[PDB]
C-alpha cells in the first residue's frame, strides 16, 4: 500500500536526465548553505521546529513606539559613497589594511551605532530577554531615544546600565544618574520595575522607581511618584531582570492614582504591572527608551529586608525532581545486590520486633 | 521527524557524497527526538532568616 505525498517532495525539481551536465556543489560550504536554507522553510511533514520551536502568535506584534525617523536615502548614499572613496584614496590606509595593522576606533563605532542600528539591536535584545512579553504582553516598540543610566560607585567610578549586563544590589543601592536627549518643552516619565522580584504573585512586578512629568532631561525636577528602592533579589532565587522604561508624554498627566507614599516600604503597595499602568495612560504616553540590567542576591540585600522592609529574609533553593525507579518487584532477576538500596529509606540498621 | 542531513566535515565518506550532489539538492534523514516533559527543577522557600 502507498499514499501520495501531501505536497512537493524534496529534490523533485532536479532534472535527472541531464545529471552529468548539472552543476555540483563541489564544496561542503555550498551544500551547508543550501541545507540551512531548506531547514528554515515550512514543510508539510513533521519537523523538529514543530515540536521544539516557540509558538509565536500568527498576528504581528503591535508596535506602540515612536514613529521611525525620516531619511533621504539618495543624499545619505551620496555622502556615504564619498566618505569611502576618501578613506580608500589614502595610501596609508591601503598599507595598514594590507599589512594587517589597521583597527577601528571602538568608541566612534558605538556613537554611530547608537544613532543608526542601535535602536533595533536593543529591541532585538529586549525581545530575547522577554521584556516585551512580560511588560506589554507581546507588544513591541523600538527604543528610539537612547537612555543612559549609570550607578555612582565610590566617587570617581560609574557602573553603566546597558541591556542585560550584571549590576549588584550593592552598586544599585542609590538612585542612578539618568540622561537622555530631549527637546525643550517635552515631558517624560521614567520608571524602574523588577520583572522577577515579586515574592508572592508570579505575574506581578515591584515598582522600584517612578518619576513623572520630567521637564526635558532634567530628571531631578520630575515628580517623585514612587521613591527609589534598591533591588532586593532573594538569595537562591536566581538572576532577576530590572528594566528602566522612558516614556514620552504628549501633555502633562495626572499620576495621583499611581502615587506611592514617601517612604514606601510596603511590598503590597509596590506591587505593579507595567501593562496596566501603560494601558490607562496610553492615550497621552508613548514608550521612548529602554535600559535594563541583571541582578542576583548579595549581602546588601539582607539589609534591605531586615532594615528597610522590616521582615525576615526569604531564602530559596533549587530543588530537583525525585529520581525515577521502576516499581519494586519481589524477585529482581539479574539485578545487582545494590538494587535493594534503591528502595531503602534509611541507612541505619533496623531490628523489627527485637 | 524528517530533517535535513548535514554530515560532519571530518566524515570523509559523507562529505564526498554531498559535494557530488547537484546544486539545489538536499539530503534528508529520519530523526528521533525526546521532548522533555518536566522542568529541571523549581525554586522552593527553604527558610525565613
Amino acid at each position: 500500500r502507498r499514499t501520495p505525498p501531501l505536497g512537493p517532495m524534496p529534490n523533485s525539481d532536479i532534472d535527472l536526465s541531464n545529471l552529468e551536465r548539472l552543476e555540483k556543489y563541489r564544496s561542503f560550504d555550498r551544500y551547508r548553505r543550501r541545507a540551512e536554507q531548506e531547514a528554515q522553510a515550512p514543510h508539510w511533514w513533521r519537523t523538529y521546529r514543530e515540536y521544539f520551536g516557540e509558538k509565536t502568535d500568527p498576528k504581528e506584534k503591535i508596535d506602540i513606539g515612536l514613529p521611525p525617523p525620516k531619511v533621504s536615502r539618495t543624499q545619505q548614499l551620496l555622502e556615504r559613497k564619498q566618505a569611502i572613496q576618501e578613506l580608500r584614496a589614502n595610501v596609508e590606509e591601503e598599507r595598514a589594511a594590507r599589512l594587517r595593522t589597521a583597527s577601528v576606533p571602538l568608541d566612534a563605532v558605538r556613537a554611530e551605532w547608537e544613532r543608526t542600528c542601535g535602536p533595533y539591536h536593543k529591541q532585538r535584545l529586549a525581545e530575547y530577554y522577554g521584556l516585551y512579553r512580560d511588560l506589554f504582553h507581546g507588544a513591541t516598540f523600538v527604543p528610539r531615544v537612547p537612555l543612559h543610566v549609570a550607578y555612582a560607585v565610590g566617587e570617581d567610578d560609574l557602573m553603566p546600565v546597558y541591556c542585560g549586563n550584571e549590576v549588584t544590589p550593592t552598586e544599585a543601592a542609590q538612585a542612578p544618574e539618568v540622561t537622555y536627549e530631549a527637546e525643550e518643552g517635552s515631558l517624560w516619565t521614567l520608571l524602574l520595575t523588577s520583572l522577577d522580584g515579586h515574592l508572592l504573585e508570579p505575574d506581578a512586578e515591584y515598582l522600584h522607581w517612578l518619576l513623572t512629568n520630567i521637564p526635558g532631561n532634567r530628571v531631578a525636577e520630575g515628580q517623585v511618584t514612587c521613591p527609589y528602592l534598591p533591588p532586593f533579589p532573594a538569595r537562591g532565587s536566581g538572576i532577576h531582570r530590572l528594566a528602566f522604561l522612558l516614556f514620552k508624554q504628549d501633555q502633562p498627566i495626572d499620576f495621583s492614582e499611581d502615587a506611592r507614599p514617601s517612604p514606601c516600604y510596603q511590598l503590597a503597595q509596590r506591587t505593579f504591572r507595567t501593562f496596566d499602568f501603560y494601558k490607562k495612560h496610553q492615550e497621552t504616553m508613548t514608550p521612548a527608551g529602554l535600559s535594563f540590567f541583571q541582578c542576583r542576591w548579595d549581602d546588601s540585600v539582607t539589609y534591605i529586608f531586615h532594615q528597610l522592609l522590616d521582615m525576615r529574609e526569604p531564602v530559596f533553593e533549587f530543588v530537583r525532581p525525585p529520581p525515577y525507579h521502576p516499581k519494586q518487584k519481589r524477585f529482581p532477576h539479574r539485578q545487582p545486590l545494590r538494587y535493594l538500596d534503591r528502595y531503602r529509606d534509611s541507612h541505619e540498621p533496623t531490628y523489627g520486633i527485637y | 521527524t524528517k530533517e535535513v542531513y548535514v554530515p560532519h566535515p571530518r566524515n570523509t565518506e559523507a562529505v564526498d557524497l554531498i559535494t557530488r550532489l547537484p546544486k539545489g539538492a538536499v539530503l534528508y534523514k529520519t530523526f528521533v527526538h525526546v521532548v522533555p516533559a518536566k522542568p529541571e527543577g523549581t525554586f522552593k522557600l527553604v527558610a525565613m532568616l
Binding site: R2, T3, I14 | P22, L27
Partner: peptide, 21 residues
C-alpha cells in the same frame, strides 16, 4: 515508512552518477 506520504524522502542515490566498477 512505505505506507506514509513521506516514503522515500531520504532517497539520494538517484541523484549521484552510477559508479559501480
Amino acid at each position: 515508512y512505505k505506507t506514509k506520504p513521506t516514503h522515500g524522502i531520504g532517497k539520494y542515490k538517484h541523484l549521484i552518477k552510477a559508479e559501480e566498477p
